[PDB]
C-alpha cells in the first residue's frame, strides 16, 4: 500500500534508497517465473549485512521467498565482520556500503572475507581508485579499502577492510560542466599464486596498445606472496585515467581465467578503457549511480553534472525511475550550447537530508 | 582432599622461602602405566620471565637442579609464564630427520607465586620481599603484582 516494486532489478539500489530515505519498501516477484524462484543466497546475506549495519530495520520474507517487506531503522554502522558467500564476491557487497557508509553513528571498520572479485562485478582496486576519488570530490575526506589479503575467483579466502572515518553531515553539491583534461593514465596489475612474468606479459601488451599517445602512462605491478595470495591462482588488471587538476577518474578492469593470454587481456582492458573514456562525460559510466545518488542526497539546492548522449541508456533510466519512485525528484536535463558534443547537464535539487545519528 | 594446593620452596640456609598455589595437577600414578621415569639430570627451559620478580623466581627455581647437564641429557622441563601462572610440564624426546618429537610424562601443573619471604620457613617474622595483592582495585590489570 506504500511502496511496491517488481523484480530483482536494481535491487541493491532499491534497498539502499529505502534505508537512506527512511521510507518502508516492499519488493515482490523476485524472479517468480523460475524453477528456483525467490531471493538468492547472496542477496539474503546482503540483507542480513544491512541488518548488521543498521539498527531497528526489520526484514520479513514470504514463504515463497520472493516477497520482501522492509521497514528501515537508523544507520548505526560500526565495526563488524562479515563472511560473504562464494556465489558472489566482496564487490557486490561493498559497493552499496560505499554510499551507505559516511552517515552512520560510528566509523565504518568492516572486514569482508571471501572471493575478492570476478567478471561481472567490481574489483577491489577498481572501487578503490575508481570510486574513492569521486567520494573525495563529493565531500568525504578519510575513506579507504585496506586490501589485507587477496582472494581468488574459485576459492577466494581473501580479506578486505572497508574503513571510512569521515562522518560527513551531508555530501556537498557538485558542479562539473567541463570535460576533464585527462592528465595521467595509471593502473595496477595484481597476481595471485602464479608466475610473476604473467604481469609483464600483461603490462607490455597493454602499454604497447596505449603507447601511441602523448599521455603519461604508468602501470604498476604487484604479486602477492605468502598467505596474502588467497587459495587459488588468479590475476587481474585495472587501469584508471586520472585527471589531477580537479581529481576525476575513469577506469576499466578485468580478471583472467583458464586460457586467458595476458597480452590479449591487457589489450582488452586498454580498449575497454578507451570505450569508457570516449563514451563517458565528466564521470565514469560505472561511477554514475554513486554520482547521482550523492547529487540527490546533496543539500537543498541544485547541483549540475555533465554527461553525454551516450550515458542515457536503460540502466540510467531504471536509476532515475527508482529515485522518482523513492523520493520523487525530477532530474532536469539541460543541453549544453555547443552541439559539436551533444552533452546533457543534469541538474538535481538535493533532498535536504542530514545524518541524524551523530552524538553531538 | 587429595588435590595438592601449596608448594612451599625454602632454600633453608638463611635463604628465601617462596610459596606457590598449585592449581591443576595431573598424576601419572593415576593415569599412565608406561614404565619408569627417565631420571637423567635434565635440561630446563623458561618462557618469558622478564620481570625482576621473574628473574628472582627463576633463580631460586633453577638453582635446585643438577648443575651442568650433558648434550645427550634427554628430559627437558618447562616453566612457561602465561600471565603469572608458571605452567610446568616435562618431556623426553629424540631427534628425527624431520625434526623433534616430544613425549609427555611425569606431572603437569601450574603454580602462582603468592609469598616470597627472606627468612626461613619456621619464623613468620620474616620480612616480605614480595607477596601478591589480591584486593587492590587494579589486581587483574598487571602481572607480577
Amino acid at each position: 500500500k506504500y511502496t511496491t516494486f517488481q523484480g530483482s532489478q536494481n535491487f541493491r539500489l532499491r534497498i539502499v534508497l529505502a534505508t537512506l530515505s527512511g521510507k518502508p519498501i516492499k519488493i515482490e516477484k523476485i524472479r517468480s517465473g523460475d524453477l528456483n524462484p525467490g531471493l538468492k543466497d547472496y542477496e539474503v546475506s546482503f540483507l542480513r549485512l544491512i541488518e548488521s549495519v543498521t539498527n531497528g530495520s526489520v526484514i520479513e520474507i514470504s514463504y515463497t521467498g520472493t516477497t520482501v517487506i522492509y521497514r528501515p531503522g537508523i544507520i548505526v554502522g560500526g565495526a563488524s565482520t562479515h563472511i560473504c558467500p562464494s556465489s558472489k564476491p566482496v564487490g557486490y557487497f561493498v559497493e552499496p556500503m560505499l554510499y551507505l557508509a559516511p552517515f552512520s553513528k560510528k566509523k565504518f571498520s568492516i572486514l569482508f572475507k571471501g572471493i575478492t572479485a570476478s567478471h561481472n562485478d567490481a574489483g577491489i582496486e577498481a572501487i578503490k581508485w575508481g570510486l574513492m576519488p569521486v567520494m573525495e570530490k563529493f565531500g568525504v575526506r578519510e575513506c579507504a579499502l585496506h586490501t589485507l589479503k587477496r582472494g581468488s575467483p574459485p576459492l577466494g579466502g581473501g580479506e578486505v577492510h572497508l574503513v571510512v572515518d569521515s562522518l560527513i553531515a551531508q555530501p556537498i553539491t557538485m558542479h562539473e560542466i567541463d570535460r576533464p583534461i585527462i592528465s595521467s593514465i595509471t593502473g595496477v596489475a595484481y597476481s595471485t599464486r602464479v608466475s610473476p612474468s604473467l604481469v609483464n606479459r600483461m603490462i607490455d601488451g597493454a602499454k604497447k596498445v596505449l603507447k601511441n599517445l602523448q599521455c603519461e602512462v604508468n602501470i604498476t605491478a604487484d604479486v602477492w606472496r605468502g598467505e596474502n595470495s588467497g587459495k587459488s591462482p588468479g590475476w587481474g588488471i585495472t587501469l584508471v585515467a586520472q585527471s589531477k587538476q580537479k581529481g576525476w577518474s575513469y577506469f576499466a578492469e578485468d580478471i583472467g581465467d583458464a586460457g586467458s593470454i595476458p597480452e590479449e587481456l591487457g589489450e582488452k582492458v586498454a580498449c575497454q578503457l578507451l570505450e569508457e573514456i570516449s563514451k563517458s562525460a565528466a564521470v565514469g559510466r560505472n561511477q554514475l549511480p554513486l554520482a547521482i545518488v550523492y547529487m540527490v542526497i546533496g543539500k537543498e539546492d541544485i547541483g549540475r553534472l555533465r554527461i553525454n548522449k551516450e550515458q542515457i541508456d536503460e540502466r540510467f533510466i531504471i536509476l532515475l525511475r527508482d529515485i522518482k519512485k523513492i523520493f520523487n525528484t525530477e532530474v532536469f536535463l539541460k543541453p549544453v550550447d555547443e552541439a559539436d558534443n551533444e552533452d546533457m547537464i543534469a541538474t538535481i535539487k538535493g533532498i535536504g537530508f542530514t545524518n541524524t545519528s551523530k552524538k553531538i | 582432599r587429595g588435590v595438592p594446593t601449596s608448594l612451599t620452596i625454602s632454600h633453608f640456609p638463611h635463604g628465601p622461602t617462596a610459596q606457590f598455589s598449585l592449581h591443576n595437577v595431573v598424576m601419572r600414578h593415576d593415569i599412565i602405566n608406561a614404565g619408569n621415569q627417565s631420571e637423567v639430570n635434565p635440561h630446563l627451559i623458561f618462557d618469558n620471565f622478564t620481570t625482576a620478580l621473574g628473574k628472582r623466581v627463576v633463580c631460586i627455581l633453577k638453582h635446585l637442579f643438577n648443575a651442568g647437564p650433558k648434550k645427550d641429557s634427554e628430559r627437558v622441563i618447562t616453566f612457561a609464564n602465561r600471565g603469572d601462572f608458571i605452567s610446568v610440564r616435562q618431556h623426553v624426546y629424540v631427534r628425527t630427520r624431520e625434526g623433534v618429537e616430544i613425549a609427555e610424562v611425569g606431572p603437569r601443573f601450574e603454580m602462582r607465586l603468592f609469598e616470597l619471604r627472606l627468612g626461613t620457613l619456621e619464623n613468620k617474622d620474616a620480612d616480605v620481599e614480595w607477596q601478591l595483592r589480591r584486593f587492590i582495585r587494579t589486581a587483574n590489570k598487571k602481572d607480577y603484582l
Binding site: - | 591443576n24 651442568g68 600471565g83
Partner: protein, 38 residues
C-alpha cells in the same frame, strides 16, 4: 558485576599445543637455559 582477579587458567588443547610447539621450537634451537659447571 565486577570481579577481583583473573580465574584459574583452564588447560585446553589449544594451550597445550602452544606450549608443545614452543618447547619443540626451543629444543630445535637447542636453546635450553640450564646451569653451568662454574
Amino acid at each position: 558485576f565486577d570481579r577481583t582477579a583473573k580465574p584459574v587458567p583452564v588447560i585446553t588443547s589449544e594451550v597445550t599445543e602452544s606450549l608443545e610447539d614452543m618447547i619443540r621450537r626451543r629444543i630445535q634451537d637447542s636453546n635450553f637455559d640450564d646451569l653451568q659447571r662454574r
